[PDB]
Design a protein around this ligand. Sequence first.
Ligand code: 8F6
Length: 124
Amino acid sequence: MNPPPPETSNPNKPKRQTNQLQYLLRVVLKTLWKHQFAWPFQQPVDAVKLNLPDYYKIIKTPMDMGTIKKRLENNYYWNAQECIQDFNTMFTNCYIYNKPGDDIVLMAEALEKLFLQKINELPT
Ligand SMILES: C[C@@H]1C(=O)N(C)c2ccc(N[C@H](C)c3ccccc3)cc2N1C1CC1
């Protein structure tokens, strides 16, 4: 019921290190990670463990902060926007699979606001 997790390395994809990508790891990801609502998002959704057999029947581009963390540590991204897109996919997946007012959605909404707060101003 679980697909393979998203890749964290890809040898035919070019790598890059930028000040904004370093910030996304040092400040943005590592701050969100310690939030009281971060724990559902620190690893790929396990549909067998969590008893959610339809999760990947609904979510076709899964993403989580553990994957993002590993991509940042491997310089997998070309630029900050690509990483920001992964965060946005993670949040949107949560809204798609659930419904408004759900506990998990309240968590994602709070994390998304803190995320936007932190990426509002990036290094040059
Ligand atoms: C799949 C969906 C989702 O989109 N994500 C990202 C996710 C990640 C970790 C968990 N673990 C427990 C079960 C939990 C249950 C309620 C409130 C917060 C956590 C649950 C979810 N939910 C499910 C609630 C329906």
